[PDB]
């Protein structure tokens, strides 16, 4: 038995504690790099919370057993000055992840796919406690966001997935691929950076129109 609830500002520490236990250790890129202590990822994860559209799954004892942290994303302004997230990161391992994210954004802009949309929901951090996996919690977290989208006239939910394994979960939930890149083809300075196990394959950006 569990609830799905809006994450409140006072939940920040508990959210970080849960992420440090699971996501920091078990998301494929993080574990491949052996991310370790990473205050930059803590900072990254707390950022979307004040957008008031991030959800926690909470067990019968009041413990957080899953989160989906989402933020609003806006179409770049006509006078936009694009910035690389990796530039302001001092943690070398997390910088590799941010650099990959920057590369994806350089190759693919979700707003090109949906010219009429000004605001899109961005699913940033998805994590479920191991002992509660395979129960559909990811789906119920995702579904709660549909409520927010309806309430705010948002049509598109965009989720960058770091493995084919998690992309498949999003497919089950009704998302489709909009961009992909194999790890074997990601060679920003001429050489492969990420070489996780073969089944991960690469990143897939997933989208659903709700
Ligand atoms: C991705 C993740 C959030 C999925 O959460 P979830 O609530 O377990 O999702 P689901 O219940 O839909 O299970 C997904 C699949 O995991 C598999 N699974 C089944 N039991 C499982 C278990 N005990 N443990 C792990 N995986 C299990 C199944 O293939 C299942 O699919 P199916 O139920 O449709 O057959 C979770 O695996 C996770 O936290 N992974 C590590 C962090 C990560 O990679 N996050 C996503 C980054 S994009
Ligand atoms: C939806 C989701 O959880 N994407 C994960 C991207 C990612 C972010 C930070 C470190 C590693 C990987
Ligand atoms: C079009 C398709 O077959 N996509 C799934 C395989 C895949 C390819 C690249 C990165 C991640 C995953």
UniProtKB/Swiss-Prot annotation:
Site (Might be involved in substrate binding): 44
Induction: Expression at the transcriptional or the translational level is not regulated in a circadian fashion.
Upper lineage: Eukaryota, Metazoa, Ecdysozoa, Arthropoda, Hexapoda
EC assignment: 2.3.1.87
Any one Gene Ontology molecular-function term assigned to this protein's record: arylamine N-acetyltransferase activity
Annotated site residues (Acetyl-CoA) in this chain: 172
Disulfide bridge positions per record: none
Protein name: Arylalkylamine N-acetyltransferase 1
KW Protein biosynthesis (keyword) present: no
Organs and tissues of expression: In the adult, expressed in the midgut portion of the thoracic segments and the frontal half of the abdomen (at protein level). Expressed in the epithelial cell layer facing the lumen of the gut (at protein level). In the brain, expressed in a sub-populations of neurons and astrocytes, and in a set of distinct stripes in the optic lobes (at protein level). Expressed mainly in serotonergic neurons but also in subsets of glutamatergic, GABAergic and cholinergic neurons (at protein level).
UniProt-annotated location(s): Cytoplasm; Nucleus
Effect of residue 158 to A: Does not affect catalytic activity
Binding site for acetyl-CoA: 126-128, 134-138
Pathway, per record: Aromatic compound metabolism; melatonin biosynthesis; melatonin from serotonin: step 1/2
Organism: Drosophila melanogaster
Shown residues within the full chain: 56 to 265 of 275
């Amino acid at each position: 038995p569990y609830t799905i609830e809006l994450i409140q500002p006072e939940d920040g520490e508990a959210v970080i504690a849960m992420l440090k236990t699971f996501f920091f250790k078990d998301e494929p890129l993080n574990t491949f790099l052996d991310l370790g202590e990473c205050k930059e990822l803590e900072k990254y994860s707390l950022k979307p919370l004040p957008d008031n559209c991030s959800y926690k799954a909470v067990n019968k004892k009041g413990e957080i057993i899953g989160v989906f942290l989402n933020g609003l994303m806006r179409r770049p302004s006509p006078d936009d000055v694009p910035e690389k997230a990796a530039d302001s990161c001092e943690h070398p391992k997390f910088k590799k992840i941010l650099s990959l994210m920057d590369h994806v954004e350089e190759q693919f802009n979700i707003f090109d796919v949906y010219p009429d949309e000004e605001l899109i929901l961005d699913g940033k951090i998805l994590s479920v406690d191991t002992n509660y996996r395979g129960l559909g919690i990811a789906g119920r977290l995702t579904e709660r966001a549909y409520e927010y989208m309806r309430e705010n006239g948002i049509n598109v939910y965009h989720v960058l997935c770091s493995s084919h394994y998690s992309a498949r979960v999003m497919e089950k939930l009704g998302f489709h691929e909009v961009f992909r890149m194999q790890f074997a083809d990601y060679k920003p300075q001429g050489e492969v950076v990420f070489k996780p196990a073969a089944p991960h394959v690469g990143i897939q950006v997933m989208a659903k129109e709700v």
